Amino acid sequence: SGPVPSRARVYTDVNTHRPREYWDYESHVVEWGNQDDYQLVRKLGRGKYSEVFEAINITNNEKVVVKILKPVKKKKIKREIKILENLRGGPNIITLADIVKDPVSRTPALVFEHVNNTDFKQLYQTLTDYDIRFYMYEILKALDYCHSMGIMHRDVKPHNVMIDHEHRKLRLIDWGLAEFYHPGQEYNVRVASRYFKGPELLVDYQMYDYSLDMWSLGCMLASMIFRKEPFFHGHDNYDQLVRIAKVLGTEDLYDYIDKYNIELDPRFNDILGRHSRKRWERFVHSENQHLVSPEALDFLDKLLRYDHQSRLTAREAMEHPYFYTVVKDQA
Ligand SMILES: CC(=O)Nc1cc(Nc2cc(NC3CC3)n3ncc(C#N)c3n2)ccc1N(C)CCN
Numbered sequence: 063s064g065p066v067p068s069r070a071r072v073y074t075d076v077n078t079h080r081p082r083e084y085w086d087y088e089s090h091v092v093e094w095g096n097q098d099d100y101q102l103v104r105k106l107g108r109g110k111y112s113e114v115f116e117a118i119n120i121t122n123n124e125k126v127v128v129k130i131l132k133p134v135k136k137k138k139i140k141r142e143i144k145i146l147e148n149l150r151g152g153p154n155i156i157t158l159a160d161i162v163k164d165p166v167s168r169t170p171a172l173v174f175e176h177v178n179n180t181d182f183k184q185l186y187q188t189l190t191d192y193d194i195r196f197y198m199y200e201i202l203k204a205l206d207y208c209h210s211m212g213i214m215h216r217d218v219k220p221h222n223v224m225i226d227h228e229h230r231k232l233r234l235i236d237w238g239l240a241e242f243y244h245p246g247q248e249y250n251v252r253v254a255s256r257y258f259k260g261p262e263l264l265v266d267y268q269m270y271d272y273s274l275d276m277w278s279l280g281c282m283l284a285s286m287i288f289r290k291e292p293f294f295h296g297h298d299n300y301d302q303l304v305r306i307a308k309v310l311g312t313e314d315l316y317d318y319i320d321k322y323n324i325e326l327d328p329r330f331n332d333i334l335g336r337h338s339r340k341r342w343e344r345f346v347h348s349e350n351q352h353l354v355s356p357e358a359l360d361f362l363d364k365l366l367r368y369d370h371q372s373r374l375t376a377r378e379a380m381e382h383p384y385f386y387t388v389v390k391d392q393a
Pocket of ligand 1: 106107108109110111112113114127128129156174175176177178179221222224235236237
């Protein structure tokens with residue numbers, strides 16, 4: 063028989079209660095700005111789906127970020143656009159400022175608010191215990207918001223988190239992989255970066271939900287408090303699950319497989335083996351102990367569960383003791 067169905071335990075029917083237009087991005091008509099309002103200054107980066115530049119809007123002299131898209135299905139551009147427009151003004155969500163097209167090449171480009179970011183491979187090593195709790199709380203505000211709005215980010219990782227440390231400003235960016243949550247929908251499991259893929263993606267369980275972002279957030283938190291990047295360092299997608307199983311144990315993995323009646327890929331049978339669930343203490347040492355506390359460990363444990371239904375929601379995560387001093391300081 064097939065796999066047992068699953069539903070998000072929070073914000074389950076939020077898109078159903080909305081007009082069709084809210085989530086039916088295939089019928090979205092794109093509103094285009096003037097390409098001549100922007101002059102590219104320099105290249106900032108790239109990805110599999112785009113080339114990123116810094117630009118100046120010459121009508122108001124403001125610095126912006128321009129994401130020039132490589133060839134991609136128009137419905138995927140409509141999806142990114144619709145999600146960015148729906149989430150606009152939301153806490154710590156990047157602002158989509160404009161959408162332009164080159165009149166000759168017909169290449170579309172998305173224009174974003176600029177964040178004066180410090181590269182994580184330089185910033186993270188300077189973060190104190192308080193900074194990690196502070197920035198994790200800022201990411202949770204963005205996740206609880208997009209989840210409440212019926213959207214899963216599906217690509218939560220350090221590279222998609224822009225931090226202006228001087229101004230303690232955080233933005234969750236690159237909504238190119240984000241989707242609308244619909245109960246009963248089967249999603250593509252070939253999403254997210256290897257090191258941040260949830261167990262549901264690695265076992266090919268397609269009926270996933272917002273809880274996928276919570277696994278990714280747990281991977282991020284583990285790399286920051288343990289100063290071990292990446293935390294789960296797989297050689298490929300199969301070995302990625304082996305790396306998780308060597309920490310969380312194989313018993314809870316097979317209990318998860320059995321609960322949802324998942325047909326496990328035969329490749330896994332000879333590589334998963336048998337592993338006990340490890341204690342978080344084995345990753346604690348003299349160079350990271352200042353970042354690790356019993357409440358950081360309790361919080362991390364509640365994020366990194368094989369069973370997606372048993373992970374903390376973003377709202378539950380915000381109520382965790384790990385954030386008591388951040389919450390107090392914000393009041
Ligand atoms: C623009 C986007 O979605 N992706 C993206 C963004 C960047 N870089 C930056 C850099 C900065 N600020 C730094 C001081 C220069 N900002 N400020 C806001 C935004 C946004 N949005 C942004 N994006 C690099 C690569 C990618 N992609 C293709 C691969 C990773 N997913």
